Amino acid sequence: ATFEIVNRCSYTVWAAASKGDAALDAGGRQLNSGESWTINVEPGTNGGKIWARTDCYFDDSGSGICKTGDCGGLLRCKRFGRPPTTLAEFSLNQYGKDYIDISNIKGFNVPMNFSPTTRGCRGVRCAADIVGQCPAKLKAPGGGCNDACTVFQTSEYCCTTGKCGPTEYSRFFKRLCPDAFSYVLDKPTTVTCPGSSNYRVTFCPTA
């Protein structure tokens, strides 16, 4: 499957793509404002994610740091990124269909749209100013708006036992972005797409 990753933000981002235990395609790349990077994701990829990283430095070897979304200091991510990270999430070719969503469960750094480029389903978007409106206790000094699990490490926020409810913090994310997951047991906003669809992830879609 092809994923065209487009940075419409006025600032550079370092896109990242991983299924947690491996890179997808090269795993990461710099995207200056307006640039597009198209990756190939293997059919059947389960639990894949794409995100943006901000304020990165990388040496000639591809090693460094980012203020949001850092994946073990690598340009080419093999693992998931450090919160806060708005997440485009997908599982492909699962019994004939693809499944996509956006999630704020690991916080929010950059607004995004995640849409099919082929027929048969809708896209999803979280493009409100979550960083500007972020509750004071969730603001990440390094940049972004943390989720409450990251900040407070409680079973209620982290849904550790599989039982949890919505919270004042989850409701903030849900108010700003109704079409993204705000906590682990949120009413799902996952979209079913035809199997083997192709996609576009756009950072800062309203910019």
Side-chain angles (χ1 to χ4, degrees):
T2 63
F3 286 70
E4 185 182 2
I5 306 172
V6 181
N7 181 19
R8 189 173 292 153
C9 306
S10 61
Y11 47 87
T12 301
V13 303
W14 288 257
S18 174
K19 67 180 184 74
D21 63 348
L24 305 178
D25 195 286
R29 211 204 81 173
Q30 185 173 327
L31 285 176
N32 294 327
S33 174
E35 291 191 329
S36 305
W37 176 39
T38 302
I39 64 168
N40 294 287
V41 173
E42 185 170 25
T45 291
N46 199 18
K49 306 187 194 302
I50 287 161
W51 67 102
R53 302 170 284 174
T54 61
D55 292 307
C56 303
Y57 165 79
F58 294 108
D59 70 16
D60 303 338
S61 78
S63 289
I65 183 168
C66 300
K67 294 198 184 181
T68 68
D70 194 4
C71 61
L74 300 185
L75 172 63
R76 290 167 107 275
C77 291
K78 294 192 293 202
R79 310 275 180 273
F80 293 140
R82 187 175 192 274
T85 52
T86 322
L87 296 169
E89 305 184 311
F90 46 93
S91 296
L92 311 180
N93 311 102
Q94 301 300 301
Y95 307 99
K97 297 291 179 184
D98 291 357
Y99 296 89
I100 67 169
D101 70 76
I102 293 170
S103 175
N104 288 317
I105 289 167
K106 295 292 186 176
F108 177 103
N109 63 340
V110 175
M112 49 163 57
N113 183 95
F114 182 16
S115 291
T117 58
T118 53
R119 64 91 200 170
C121 56
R122 69 167 185 105
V124 289
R125 183 178 288 198
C126 176
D129 187 16
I130 282 177
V131 177
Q133 302 292 13
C134 187
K137 291 185 165 178
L138 297 185
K139 289 181 167 165
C145 190
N146 289 310
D147 63 286
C149 172
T150 294
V151 176
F152 297 104
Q153 298 283 98
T154 69
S155 63
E156 192 65 18
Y157 294 137
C158 300
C159 219
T160 305
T161 68
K163 294 282 181 193
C164 62
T167 66
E168 201 76 347
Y169 296 125
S170 73
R171 288 184 187 94
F172 158 76
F173 288 98
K174 197 62 164 186
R175 177 171 64 83
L176 278 274
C177 285
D179 286 339
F181 281 86
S182 65
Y183 74 108
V184 170
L185 294 181
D186 207 349
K187 176 170 162 193
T189 47
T190 306
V191 173
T192 307
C193 287
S196 300
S197 296
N198 296 318
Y199 303 91
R200 189 196 221 245
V201 177
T202 307
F203 302 119
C204 305
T206 71

